[PDB]
Design a binder for this molecule. Structure first.
Ligand code: MT3
Ligand code: MT3
Lengths: 276, 275
């Protein structure tokens, strides 16, 4: 269905909606085939007149008004976000035929997890601390706007041509302890997941807790067990991680703290293959 | 936490928000305990300043910008609804020093399930079918608005002073395709409605008492449905069975259910609760 939604909500959404006659979607050029879904090359004609290469995702799941309306306000929220470490939303596209589209700036190097995993790239310790730093900044911003990411992981972080990490939103082994029992998600719950993301970065994309089942994780963490220090991770950076994995959310560091702390560490390091 | 939300959204929500200077909540006067959590007696002054007796629920979970924003958009949807068989929303209240409040018209006889389980009440077969017909009418309207309910059940239906049923807002009610795809449609609602009809005719007996919550999926796959209630007419049990057709599109629409149940209901005499 097109737009049989509440007039005031539709009015609120217009600045996020892209006119389809200003978008081309190349459904024959697929960007990635993974947990991302179906992502295609797009070309967006912006109001000033700049033709922009972009990524377009089709949202195959939406149907009822409730879903679309949920989706639209989610669009409004992300549109208001402005930060070099947070992925921008260019807009959403509502169509009479087919499910809605999400339009995003093109990220040359794809998601951070794939980038660090493949042998062709040789990021140093500093590069990986750097990437982790940028995520912390991204999350430091999001936290300020009192937004809870809820799904932080290296796969959900993007990397542009200038090697700027862009946190995107798009998982029991990434969740805080209390998220697994009380279903509570907070800014501090995101801090836990950031910890796991750091582990991912310093392992160059190893799967976390490889020898435990998804259901056994809860008791595992309650045995006081934690992720083991990655081969690239320096002693002071591993201490940071462990703080992010404290069972009492309040004990865990804020994202503002992690930024200045990780930044301190980052500066002790030299030798970089991917800058900025 | 103040409106640190999007200004354009706040503009759209304005017609649903209640100024707290026009609301008194009696936090000592609890209306219902359990399932609906903590509901309180309230008094609202409408646009024109009339006192309206209401029920007020506190939303203890809603905290971050995303949650509040969703809550607001859902309020915008509910507020637009206008049908005698759907619980209307009087408004929402965003407190600076407390979690948000939902404000609803006071329903004398509480939820439909609690009302029928009570042995003090004596609803006839015609009475139970009549209630089923009203849910159907509400769900018909909801369907016409392309709105999927997702949690249709007797416990989610309210009953006012004039004995009007008001549809308001879980695996044993879930459709076969819902339990394996996480997919909800109005056809999925039709299923839950069938289970609701079963609830009415059994006067609020718990469905599938012997099969465990996890075992339900294989049970319906095997082919077993709920047995015919002791005091359920045959043409109505037939209806339920149609509502439980494994092929989603083969199930009837709420519009047809209104027509059919209306006929079945019209063939009966004897009501202790007249709508
Ligand atoms: C060359 O390699 C790649 C380049 C890419 N370049 C840009 C974007 C890419 O992927 C995406 C990253 C994030 C999203 C995405 C973001 N935000 C939301 C929330 C949301 C909700 C409601 C309204 C609006 C937004 N969703 C639901 C999303 O799906 C979609 C994407 F396609 C790329 C992927 C690539 O390889 C896999
Ligand atoms: C005399 O006895 C009773 C009288 C009652 N009289 C009116 C309402 C009652 O219960 C409720 C019925 C429904 C709701 C309710 C409705 N719709 C939504 C969606 C929603 C989402 C987002 C924004 C706005 C709305 N929610 C989240 C709700 O909680 C809350 C209630 F408290 C009563 C309960 C009674 O005893 C059990």
């Amino acid at each position: 269905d097109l737009s049989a939604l509440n007039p005031e909500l539709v009015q609120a959404v217009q600045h996020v909606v892209i006119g389809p006659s200003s978008l081309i979607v190349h459904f024959n050029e697929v960007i990635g085939r993974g947990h991302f879904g179906c992502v295609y090359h797009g070309t967006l004609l912006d109001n000033d007149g700049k033709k922009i290469h972009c990524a377009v995702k089709s949202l195959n799941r939406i149907t009822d008004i409730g879903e679309v309306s949920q989706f639209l306000t989610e669009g409004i929220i992300m549109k208001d976000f402005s930060h070099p470490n947070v992925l921008s939303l260019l807009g959403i596209c509502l169509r009479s035929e087919g499910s809605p589209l999400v339009v995003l700036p093109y990220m040359k190097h794809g998601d951070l997890r794939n980038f660090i995993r493949n042998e062709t790239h040789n990021p140093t310790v500093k590069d990986l601390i750097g990437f982790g730093l940028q995520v912390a900044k991204g999350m430091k911003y999001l936290a300020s706007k009192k937004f809870v990411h809820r799904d932080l992981a290296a796969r959900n972080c993007m990397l542009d041509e200038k090697f700027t990490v862009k946190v995107a939103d798009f998982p029991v082994k990434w969740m805080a302890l209390e998220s697994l029992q009380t279903q509570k998600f907070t800014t501090k719950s995101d801090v836990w997941s950031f910890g796991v993301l750091l582990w991912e970065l310093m392992t160059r994309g190893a799967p976390p807790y490889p020898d435990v089942n998804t259901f056994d994780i809860t008791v595992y963490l309650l045995q006081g067990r934690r992720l083991l220090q990655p081969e690239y991770c320096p002693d002071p950076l591993y201490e940071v991680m462990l703080k992010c994995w404290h069972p009492k959310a309040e004990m865990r560091p804020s994202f503002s703290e992690l930024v200045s702390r990780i930044s301190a560490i980052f500066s002790t390091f030299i030798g970089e293959h991917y800058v900025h």
